[PDB]
Amino acid sequence: VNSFSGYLKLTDNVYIKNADIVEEAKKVKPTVVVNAANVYLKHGGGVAGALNKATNNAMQVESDDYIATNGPLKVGGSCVLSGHNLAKHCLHVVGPNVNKGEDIQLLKSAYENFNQHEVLLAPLLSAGIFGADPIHSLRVCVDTVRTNVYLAVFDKNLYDKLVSSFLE
Ligand SMILES: Nc1ncnc2c1ncn2[C@@H]1O[C@H](COP(=O)(O)OP(=O)(O)OC[C@H]2O[C@H](Oc3ccc4c(C(F)(F)F)cc(=O)oc4c3)[C@H](O)[C@@H]2O)[C@@H](O)[C@H]1O
């Protein structure tokens, strides 16, 4: 249905809201919801952990099946799997793990996957356990994605810092 509302428009195509991406998915019912994944699609926490939990582990079983057939993803790569009860499709995207020393330029490649989809509900890739600077991730998203991206930022403190950092 893609009935997004409450988002602050940052650019022609990038929108931001302070919300839980799970809550937004069940209110919006988007065509595509983005997961901030690892290369093994092991959904152990953060966005992935919340999305998986909202699918009742169904997302995890499907993801294991994908990994069993294709093997781990590449950092910066993606794969289109089922959205289950949250969306039509889930676009799993692997941002770089900057904490481990992975190349942050792979964050451009990660966001580039967004361009194959007309509208996405998405988180800030690599901005959590992967330790990428939140402002930088939003900048690469803005500089990279040309389709319509609705970013759900769970943390209010981070949301206010991104809005003022961008719209100011
Ligand atoms: N519900 C939400 N809705 C909207 N936005 C949200 C939401 N929740 C977070 N964000 C925000 O999204 C942005 C991205 O953060 P993420 O950490 O989800 O993604 P990432 O940085 O690209 O790293 C990718 C990895 O994370 C996941 O693995 C883990 C594993 C363990 C933990 C643990 C702990 F078990 F070790 F303790 C604590 C923890 O907090 O997170 C983990 C992530 C996933 O399997 C992948 O391997 C941040 O700005 C965050 O603040």
Residue numbers in the entry: 3 to 170
The authors write:
However, SARS-CoV-2 can counter IFN-induced mono-ADP-ribosylation (MARylation) in host cells through its first macrodomain (Macro1) encoded within the non-structural protein 3 (nsp3).4 Macrodomains are ancient and well-conserved structural modules found in a wide range of proteins with diverse biological functions. Macrodomains are known to bind, and in some cases, hydrolyze ADP-ribosylated proteins, thus functioning as either “readers” or “erasers” of ADPr modifications. Viral macrodomains, including those of coronaviruses (CoVs), the Venezuelan equine encephalitis virus (VEEV), and the Chikungunya virus (CHIKV), are reported to hydrolyze MARylated host proteins and are responsible for attenuating host immune responses against viral infection. Given the central roles that viral macrodomains play in host cell immune responses, macrodomain inhibitors are potential antiviral agents. Viral macrodomains, which can bind to and/or hydrolyze adenine diphosphate ribose (ADP-ribose or ADPr) from proteins, have been suggested to counteract host immune response and be viable targets for the development of antiviral drugs.
TFMU-ADPr and pNP-ADPr are previously developed assay substrates for poly(ADP-ribosyl)glycohydrolase (PARG). Based on our proposal that bulkier substituents at the C1″ position may boost macrodomain binding, TFMU-ADPr and pNP-ADPr may be potential binders for macrodomains since the aromatic rings are introduced at C1″ similar to TAMRA-ADPr. Similarly, the IC50 of TFMU-ADPr against SARS-CoV-2 Macro1 is 0.59 μM, 25-fold smaller than ADPr. Therefore, pNP-ADPr and TFMU-ADPr are both potent binders of macrodomains with strong preferences for SARS-CoV-2 Macro1. To understand why TFMU-ADPr binds strongly to Macro1, we determined the X-ray crystal structure of the Macro1-TFMU-ADPr complex using diffraction data that extended to 1.9 Å resolution. The TFMU-ADPr electron density is well resolved. The TFMU moiety extends from the binding site along a narrow hydrophobic groove, bracketed on one side by the Ile131 side chain and on the other side by Gly46 and Gly47. (G) Aromatic ring of TFMU interacts with the side chain of Ile131 and on the other side, Gly46 and Gly47. An X-ray crystal structure of SARS-CoV-2 Macro1 in complex with TFMU-ADPr revealed how the TFMU moiety contributes to the binding affinity. An interesting finding of this work is that pNP-ADPr and TFMU-ADPr are strong binders of SARS-CoV-2 Macro1 and several other macrodomains. Their structures may provide clues for the future design of more potent ADPr-based probe molecules of SARS-CoV-2 Macro1.
